């Protein structure tokens, strides 16, 4: 039985989809530490997004699944009988989560504090991070999308997966001929638009192309729409997060019958000042429900911000130096061996990452026996389940197989590189494996993880639904 699974990966890795890469495959029975497969276990790999299986760990670790973030809003001194402040500030703690709607949610408290006018100006606080917005070896032909945006403490969430730092640019063709319609979203009156786009033929070839040309806050959009095309909808990211949260903060302040006098920029809370009046607060859920829209898509931003978050908990410093560090460190005292580890993001996008198929078991026997396991465990993708919550980047993979509804993963993939790692529960106990690839030259190789994936269910004992 146990002679027919190392025969069964053995010929699933011959796979062409694997030529010249390098793949490291681990797979161990968690009951028992039982070793069941293992091949280039110990090589050094990218993980792509399978880094968030580290980062998410390590935070649950640091900050607790109680965690929650803050975000306030605050003036030198209270409004008065005339029902006004001079200088505002919107302060930003961390939160991954925090929509347009809670801007409205705080502008309205403000209103009901007694302010009327902001004589002054209204600034963007979002020092409790640093100001490093991108980690160093990100490519810079990526920064346009929203897996590339920005890092900031102060940043607004799109959307209900809470994609950060970005804005929803809407494309809509008019007739033959005139220039398409641009809708920038919530950076309307932000962004700087340049549009180039025209409304081609009904019927006519869609080459229209939206950009964000690199080190500007300009949407460039060119090519042709058809007339006859339904509206493109896309998320772009823009600079400087915490100035697009000023902006619609000011936007809301407005909408709830604040005026605001002055301008609006960065700036944090002077120093100087004595006791700051707290005029509105907003609180997230917490870092137990936060790590759903996290892991199920794999949110880069809110990666990289707990890591932040992790080196403002261990160090005081919003860091991704201090980050990494705690992060390492708390995997350390999880009993993770963190030798074959380099860590340079929390989010995987960094090619200056390194994991080992090993290290990634090994978490996943200590993840799976720490007291936030459960919590662990639900954040991850589901395969095969087609609500998108549920199954997230695994909801229409693995599909009436023996996985359907039983393996919970981790993916990743860019470039010349794709993860598979997660647990795999049978009526004898739960499987831990992973699945690195490195090097292969073709699309991921998806079907290759899958059939592993899909062998190891069959081995606990699983059936395809039908
Ligand atoms: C992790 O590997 C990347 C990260 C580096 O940006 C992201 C992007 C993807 S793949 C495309 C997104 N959804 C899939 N349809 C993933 C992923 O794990 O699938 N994470
Ligand atoms: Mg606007
Ligand atoms: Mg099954």
Redesign the pocket.
Known sequence: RLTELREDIDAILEDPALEGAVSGVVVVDTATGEELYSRDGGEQLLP???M?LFTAAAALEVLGADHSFGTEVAAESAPGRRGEVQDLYLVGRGDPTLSAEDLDAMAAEVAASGVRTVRGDLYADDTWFDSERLVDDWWPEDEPYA?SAQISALTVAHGERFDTGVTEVSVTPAAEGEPADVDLGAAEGYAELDNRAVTGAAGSANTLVIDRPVGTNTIAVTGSLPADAAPVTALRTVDEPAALAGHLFEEALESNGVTVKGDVGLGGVPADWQDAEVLADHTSAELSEILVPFMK??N?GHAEMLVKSIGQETAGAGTWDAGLVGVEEALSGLGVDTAGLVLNDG???SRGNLVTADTVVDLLGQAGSAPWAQTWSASLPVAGESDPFVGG?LANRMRGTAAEGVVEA?????SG?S?LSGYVPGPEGELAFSIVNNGHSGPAPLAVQDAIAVRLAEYAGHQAPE
């Open positions: 792509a997004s399978n968030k897996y898509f794999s880069n989010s995987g996008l980047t981790k993916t990743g993939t860019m590189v993860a």
